[PDB]
Symmetry: D2
């Protein structure tokens, strides 16, 4: 469907990170994420979900995905989730907010979670 | 491994929602989510990621997952991501913060995303 | 009014931090905050706002406040804002989410902001 | 000081909202906020705090403020807090994340809080 075809592709955010994703027929997202910043090297697996029958009333398409920051090169003992929506057209965009949680002790849990926002384009 | 065995199971949060999850050998999370609140009925598919080799220095295990709120019964045109950490022991807990994004028009995008926090126990 | 009298007092959160506040007649909050954790020593000035005519339909009373983490003892070059609601009764509570932003370079801005949640009681 | 003089002024965000603020000598922020969106009319009082001795190592200046959405025209029974940092130069900017909490019943508290991000310029 249109949402599947719109989301599937290679995206970059304002940091220069690379988000490569395939949207499955009934709501799955799979792919890889490479961060331009932080305790990260090479590509990391991601999985997520999207609304595979979005409203055709002008609304965006809701989606989210997770990366755990462990691969064959490094392990930052952390995970980021991005929550957002896809907007199509000639200059398609995925607008997100994200939560990055690091494994911490309980005493340090108050400072376990960063929040931010990333906007992705196919350029 | 211990993280995999610790995370895998049936969990409930402070709202009475039900989180059924299986952790895979190298970082995958799969299962179902049923919300006690909101525009939701029955179970929804979830997928996510966790740190499959967490630090054994007393830190929790970082993880995250996504639900897109479409199933055979309803479609709320939204997605939630939970980002958090697993702590084991006799009273194991998953402590999370979450972001729920609804598909909106651009004019309404400023109010597209709710934030909250859920704590899950195996009880 | 009832909201003013309910909010005004000495509160503690789940970390053991101390929140001393006076609510003014038409929406002002003033007082001090002492954190049990982080780069902090002694009391810090806070200011904020609350809804001075909340709905009497069972809803809580919306409020927020800010602390900049500079006083005569230390300066962490950061600020926290708490956003939440007051609920009264015999065991009154202020339930909040918060954002802590540290001054950073632009290159590090992606990791400038922590998010969490604090619940305060008068005990 | 430089931070005080930099922050003080009239700012606008990407929604067209207007943020008029005066920074006081030792950390106070006072002024008014007018939102281009939502349940809002005319100007609302704001108060907040900033780091009045920021690090001069290239870091931004941490700050935050609150608006309770009650004035002589309307009362939305809500409050927003913005948490962020000021960056100066020829094209000065205040980059923020925000939390908007509405008064709700306990049953609806899970959906009490919106999160977003606003960037302000003096243009
Ligand atoms: O440092 C870590 O713990 C792992 C890398 C985190 C990179 C974050 S994820 C959110 C933000 N968006 C990016 O593309 N990179 C950062
Ligand atoms: O209303 C919707 O759009 C779908 C249901 C959302 C339920 C949310 S997800 C975060 C929070 N935790 C829960 O267990 N339920 C709510
Ligand atoms: O470390 C700093 O930069 C200053 C202290 C921050 C303490 C935070 S504010 C949110 C949370 N709630 C608390 O009572 N303490 C922490
Ligand atoms: O609808 C309300 O409850 C009151 C108005 C809220 C407007 C919000 S505050 C965060 C965001 N930034 C803006 O300039 N406007 C919206
Ligand atoms: O929701 C899913 O993954 C799905 C639905 C059909 N497959
Ligand atoms: O049974 C299914 O279709 C299923 C189960 C878990 C995840 C997914 C998915 O991500 O599609 N699909
Ligand atoms: O940007 C960061 O926080 C970062 C980057 C590389 C390594 C580390 C680390 O080892 O903490 N941290
Ligand atoms: O400069 C950094 O990234 C840094 C410094 C100290 C600790 C950590 C960490 O614990 O990630 N990271
Ligand atoms: O991480 C990588 O591969 C990389 C970073 C720059 N190239
Ligand atoms: O997968 C990659 O791009 C990769 C893997 C290891 C090192 C580097 C690098 O040094 O860029 N890049
Ligand atoms: O991963 C690889 O083979 C690779 C990365 C660069 N080549
Ligand atoms: O066939 C349907 O259920 C349908 C068709 C269009 C929109 C929607 C919706 O927005 O639920 N639902
Ligand atoms: O990213 C990692 O896995 C990492 C980083 C520093 C040291 C070590 C180690 O000593 O294993 N591991
Ligand atoms: O080089 C390392 O230390 C390394 C590499 C990959 C994963 C891990 C880990 O999971 O610690 N550590
Ligand atoms: O994984 C890391 O190094 C990391 C993660 C979150 C924050 C920080 C930091 O603030 O250094 N570092
Ligand atoms: O990261 C993964 O899913 C994975 C690693 C091996 N499989
Ligand atoms: O190639 C892989 O192992 C892979 C790719 C995508 C997702 C996952 C996963 O979620 O394990 N694993
Ligand atoms: O809790 C909610 O917001 C909710 C619950 C059921 C339906 C709807 C809706 O149809 O918006 N919304
Ligand atoms: O009471 C509710 O849940 C409600 C009311 C109006 C609109 C919506 C919505 O758009 O979800 N939801
Ligand atoms: O959603 C359901 O199945 C349900 C809710 C109560 N039972
Ligand atoms: O999967 C379920 O539990 C389910 C499915 C449809 C309706 C209901 C219900 O009405 O509880 N429950
Ligand atoms: O889904 C089902 O079969 C079911 C739900 C209750 N029985
Ligand atoms: O063998 C390894 O890479 C290893 C072993 C224990 C801890 C860590 C780590 O925390 O990176 N890494
Ligand atoms: O949850 C849904 O899919 C839904 C809810 C109300 C109406 C419709 C519809 O008219 O399709 N669909
Ligand atoms: O009953 C309905 O309208 C319905 C049921 C499942 C999905 C959808 C949808 O995706 O609109 N709509
Ligand atoms: O899916 C829904 O009905 C929904 C989602 C987010 C917020 C609300 C609401 O505030 O009603 N409703
Ligand atoms: O809003 C205010 O501070 C106020 C109103 C009267 N004083
Ligand atoms: O003019 C006013 O009443 C005013 C102006 C700024 C702040 C406040 C306050 O915090 O009450 N009140
Ligand atoms: O909990 C913290 O991050 C903390 C506590 C004291 C000092 C410092 C510091 O000097 O960074 N940081
Ligand atoms: O352990 C800590 O609190 C710590 C370590 C390195 C850097 C910082 C910081 O920059 O606050 N804080
Ligand atoms: O900060 C203080 O005064 C304090 C901390 C313990 N006493
Ligand atoms: O204001 C206070 O409580 C205070 C001030 C300085 C030091 C300490 C302390 O060492 O507790 N406490
Ligand atoms: O601040 C003070 O005088 C004090 C703190 C303890 N005594
Ligand atoms: O007199 C008024 O304006 C009034 C009285 C009660 C409630 C409300 C309200 O909730 O706006 N407004
Ligand atoms: O909290 C502070 O102000 C502080 C902390 C460490 C060093 C210094 C300094 O060298 O000024 N200042
Ligand atoms: O002891 C210090 O360095 C100190 C004390 C208070 C404020 C500051 C500052 O603002 O740097 N520094
Ligand atoms: O002010 C500080 O020391 C501080 C503030 C935020 C995070 C951290 C940290 O992660 O150490 N430290
Ligand atoms: O912190 C303050 O407001 C202050 C300090 C002097 N006045
Ligand atoms: O005693 C003080 O200086 C004080 C007390 C509360 C707030 C403020 C302020 O916002 O400056 N200043
Ligand atoms: O953007 C909004 O949510 C909005 C705008 C005006 C009025 C209302 C309301 O009365 O809820 N809500
Ligand atoms: O369209 C809107 O803004 C709207 C619709 C229903 C309820 C509310 C609300 O409760 O703000 N707002
Ligand atoms: O709110 C106002 O005054 C306004 C909005 C447009 N003019
Ligand atoms: O303070 C203002 O700008 C104001 C006040 C009331 C109405 C309007 C308007 O209708 O623009 N504007
Ligand atoms: O508030 C006023 O006087 C005004 C607003 C427009 N004139
Ligand atoms: O005089 C001081 O305390 C001072 C001067 C410059 C920087 C700092 C700091 O960053 O703490 N502190
Ligand atoms: O914004 C307000 O105060 C408001 C809005 C609608 C109705 C009422 C009322 O009936 O008081 N009040
Ligand atoms: O016109 C109204 O209802 C009104 C105007 C200002 C404040 C309030 C309130 O606080 O309800 N209500
Ligand atoms: O004050 C309002 O009308 C308001 C506040 C938050 C969300 C919404 C909404 O989602 O309509 N409306
Ligand atoms: Na996911
Ligand atoms: Na404030
Ligand atoms: Tb499937
Ligand atoms: Tb680091
Ligand atoms: Tb490379
Ligand atoms: Tb290692
Ligand atoms: Tb795999
Ligand atoms: Tb709804
Ligand atoms: Tb059922
Ligand atoms: Tb439908
Ligand atoms: Tb006043
Ligand atoms: Tb620190
Ligand atoms: Tb003391
Ligand atoms: Tb100093
Ligand atoms: Tb002062
Ligand atoms: Tb509304
Ligand atoms: Tb006007
Ligand atoms: Tb009214």
């Amino acid at each position: 469907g249109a949402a599947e075809a719109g989301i599937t592709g290679t995206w970059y955010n304002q940091l220069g990170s690379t988000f490569i994703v395939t949207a499955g027929a009934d709501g799955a997202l799979t792919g890889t994420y490479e961060s331009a910043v932080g305790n990260a090297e090479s590509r990391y697996v991601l999985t997520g979900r999207y609304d595979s029958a979005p409203a055709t009333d002008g609304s965006g398409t809701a989606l989210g995905w997770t990366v755990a920051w462990k691969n064959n090169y490094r392990n930052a003992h952390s995970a980021t989730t991005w929550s957002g929506q896809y907007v199509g057209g000639a200059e398609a965009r995925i607008n997100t907010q994200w939560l990055l949680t690091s494994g911490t002790t309980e005493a340090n849990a108050w400072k376990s979670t960063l929040v931010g926002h990333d906007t992705f384009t196919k350029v």
